[PDB]
């Protein structure tokens, strides 16, 4: 059972994809920053 | 507690009055196995098979 077959194959090959230039980190609160600004 | 399927189990996920003092009813894992896995209480003992036979002693009582 590869688990990548049928509908899941479609989802993982054409519907859902992974892209470059992406970052994932935990988020905290900073009232000093403006509403449209994100702290990096 | 083994169940064929996880989504549909029945009333086995809820605490029972038989759990009083044997298995904790306030602490159960959260998720798919919610209530299927039960933690034993502090004063919890599991009985073991007795080598001696109580049949002979029962007749003495009456």
């Amino acid at each position: 059972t590869p688990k990548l077959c049928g509908l899941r194959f479609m989802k993982d090959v054409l519907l859902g994809k992974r892209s470059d230039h992406t970052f994932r980190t935990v988020v905290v609160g900073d009232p000093s920053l403006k509403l449209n600004e994100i702290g990096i | 507690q083994q169940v064929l399927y996880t989504g549909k189990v029945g009333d086995a996920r809820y605490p029972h009055p038989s759990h009083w003092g044997r298995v904790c009813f306030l602490s159960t894992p959260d998720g798919e196995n919610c209530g299927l896995v039960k933690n034993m209480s502090l004063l919890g003992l599991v009985s073991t098979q007795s080598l001696e036979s109580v049949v002979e002693k029962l007749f003495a009582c009456g």
Partner: protein, 61 residues
């Protein structure tokens, strides 16, 4: 580990685990209690109405 003294056990286990696991391939394995229906009590079910006598050792249900 059991029997005799624990002076040599000090040069050994950390005396923080009572010991209930198995060393299979260097990884500790612990059994989980499995709840099973009692086989020494008459079992009555519905749809259909039936009463069954469980089998102790051989399939004499």
């Amino acid at each position: 580990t059991s029997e005799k003294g624990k002076e040599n056990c000090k040069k050994g286990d950390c005396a923080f685990d009572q010991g209930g696991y198995f060393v299979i391939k260097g990884a500790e394995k612990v059994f989980i209690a499995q709840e099973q229906m009692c086989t020494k009590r008459l079992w009555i079910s519905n749809s259909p109405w039936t009463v069954s006598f469980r089998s102790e050792n051989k399939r004499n249900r």
